[PDB]
Amino acid sequence: STGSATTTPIDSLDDAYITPVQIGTPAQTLNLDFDTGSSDLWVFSSETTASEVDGQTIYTPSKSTTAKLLSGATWSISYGDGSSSSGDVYTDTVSVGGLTVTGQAVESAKKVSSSFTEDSTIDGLLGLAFSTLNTVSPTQQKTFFDNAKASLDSPVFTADLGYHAPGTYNFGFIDTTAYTGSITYTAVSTKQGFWEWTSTGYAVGSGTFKSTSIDGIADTGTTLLYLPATVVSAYWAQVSGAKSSSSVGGYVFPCSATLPSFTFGVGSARIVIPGDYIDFGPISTGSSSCFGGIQSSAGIGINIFGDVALKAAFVVFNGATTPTLGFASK
DSSP: OOEEEEEEESSOOOOEEEEEETTTTTTEEEEEEEEETTTEEOOOOTTSSSSSSSSOOBBBBBOOOOOEEEEEEEEEEEOOTEEEEEEEEEEEEEETTTTTEEEEEEEEEEEEOHHHHHHHHHOOEEESGGGGOOBSSSSSOOOOHHHHGGGSSSSEEEEEEOOSSOOOESOOOOOOTTSSSOOOOOOOTTTSSSEEEEEEEEEETOOOOOOEEEEEEEEEEEEEEEEHHHHHHHHHHHTTTTTEEETTTEEEEEEOOOOOEEEEEETTEEEEGGGGEEEEEEESSSSSEEESEEOOOTTTSSEEEOOOHHSSEEEEEOOSSEEEEEEEEO
16 A cells, blocks of 8 residues: 655744644544654544644544544653643544554544644644654554554655645655655664664855764654754854854844755765755844754754755655665755
């Protein structure tokens, strides 16, 4: 089997991407944030505290003939940006882009933090990291990909995120029309439950490539690119007037600037992030100070190849017995 679904930015900054997912019988379609940095599929639901729902589409298990309470199971998750959610669990039929999993754990939110409430366009998350990170207790549950894997034509999914435009998540096949050149594959460590790999270095603009190992995760659920302070300082030093602002919470730059590209290494290959991808616009409405898309990972504890980086590539998440990651230009 295979599946193919379009993913769409939630706003004009590409702060996140939503992909329609069919849950239950008859289908209830919710728009979920596919997150390769977590491993819970959770949704706004009929159980969610009413004051914490503001515009989201909810899953109502009582209207699904295939929904079953997973008795005794609870879940609770906290994300890197400080947001969180928690609730109980149903199993139900879940389909993405024509690919169907029966018995998928669908985590029903009883509580969500303010950032989720305030984002009316995100109806929940679908985690695509390794199932060892799944938070369901006392019986840990598998991700949608893990459940689908054996039925897939090939044990892979791909992320093809757009810059200010729709893109695609495919399951079970590599669309050879979706990228240019060849795909370069690189080793993954699953030790922390992430799609963790090591980039071979970077360049700023038309500058020379610096060979240096940068360990980090491929995380579709993180907006920006978080890298070591040394790397990030070297980037922003090439933008007149750029500075790290404690009050704003990262590097800012004059909105009048033309940003340089940023290149990262994948083995001997190179992925180029155009400067425009690094512009996250005014820090507040009408400001002439703009927020940078490359930020320091210092104090996160891990480097994160978020959407800023991933949207510059066609990315293969290879879930074969020895997982790997592939990157191609597009």
